[PDB]
Design a protein around this nucleic acid. Sequence first.
DNA 1: ATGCTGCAT
DNA 2: ATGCTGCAT
Lengths: 10, 10
Amino acid sequence: TXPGVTXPGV
Amino acid sequence: TXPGVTXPGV
DNA sequence: ATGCTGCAT
DNA sequence: ATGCTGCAT
């Protein structure tokens, strides 16, 4: 995710 | 992937 | 160290 | 049934 907690996605 | 064999990703 | 996701062939 | 992506905090 994010980053943090990529995207989603990428 | 693709689809097929989405993306990656999505 | 954590933390989601999407279908054509 | 079978493919895989990506970093700030």
